[PDB]
């Protein structure tokens with residue numbers, strides 16, 4: 408465990424090409440480096456991290472790192488002043504959580520509209536002309552676009568285009584009370600997506616694989632994917648191009664911009680070797696190229712690499728989108744935001760719910776939830792995860808189970824303590840709300856609302 412490195416990275420990125428860096432390391436350090444690509448590792452990491460085996464180093468987009476940093480799951484990083492100049496200021500900004508760097512930035516990624524020349528020589532400038540493009544081209548399975556409708560990352564650029572946003576960026580810090588998924592604009596974005604599924608232009612259950620496989624084969628004129636896709640489309644031998652995303656209601660489409668980042672685990676026996684690896688083998692030109700060859704990272708964080716590769720019109724298109732869109736927050740609430748919007752988009756797309764109804768929930772689930780203080784922490788001792796029983800008389804509950812709002816507290820607590828959702832308890836929002844709403848009838852009783 409102490410003798411070697413086990414790195415984690417998502418299935419879509421170039422893990423073999425990283426394995427090539429790992430072997431290059433092994434050679435002149437005598438330190439084996441294993442690359443693994445599990446499923447749902449962004450969620451898997453905080454599980455195993457505190458509960459035994461986690462990896463030495465973890466790759467993900469920066470948005471999740473603030474959460475892990477808050478949970479104390481990451482070693483603070485120590486790249487000297489000299490090394491910091493090798494990478495763009497703004498990429499460093501993406502991995503700072505409360506004035507301390509928490510990961511290395513690798514590459515900056517935003518998804519783009521992917522042409523299909525030979526099918527569509529002149530890509531649609533706007534969104535709203537899509538329905539009249541799929542209808543101009545249909546007699547086989549001659550469809551115009553197929554993108555992942557299972558992940559909110561892909562649907563979001565639409566929802567954001569006309570005024571949708573996650574957390575408002577006000578006064579140099581993101582305000583977790585200002586959520587824009589309920590607004591006129593988001594509501595419009597989603598109505599369109601729903602009107603594509605309604606008018607049979609898309610299928611509500613289109614996976615990443617379903618979308619890629621259908622495009623690669625040559626069925627769809629367009630897809631929406633990021634830089635890690637290109638590599639499989641070269642293989643496809645499909646005459647493709649990469650460009651600005653269509654403009655919904657005239658306003659630009661706004662992709663949430665990801666910065667691939669590499670965190671060292673707070674519980675990594677080998678924290679000194681991890682630095683060596685990342686700083687001195689990966690974040691080198693010969694290092695980043697090894698990966699990039701395998702699955703294109705996008706635009707990299709390395710200055711000394713980037714400008715000699717800004718000619719490449721796909722990178723330039725990626726970057727155009729990146730600048731139209733907005734950089735993701737790293738703050739812990741992001742975990743919840745994604746949950747909120749994933750449920751919301753999917754619940755709409757299936758008719759399960761109306762746009763209004765859906766995004767109504769989305770807004771509340773994204774928002775801060777009161778009475779957490781009464782539930783998280785010491786009170787959780789009342790729950791022994793072996794039997795699954797709860798002692799409602801545990802003094803750790805601070806008497807809360809009995810009293811005018813006892814029944815309500817029991818609802819919220821048990822909910823959160825049983826919650827298997829990610830993030831923990833995100834499914835218990837209504838009940839926490841109800842419980843706080845109850846506390847209000849008896850304010851002389853519950854100074855649980857002193858802030």
Ligand SMILES: OC[C@H]1O[C@H](O[C@H]2[C@H](O)[C@@H](O)[C@@H](O)O[C@@H]2CO)[C@H](O)[C@@H](O)[C@@H]1O
Nearest residue numbers: 417419468470471558559560561665745
């Ligand atoms: O859609 C929710 C999901 O979006 C982002 O994850 C991206 C990631 O940034 C990409 O590099 C690539 O792996 O695709 C993912 C979406 O399938 C967020 O960064 C992530 O936190 C969030 O759950």
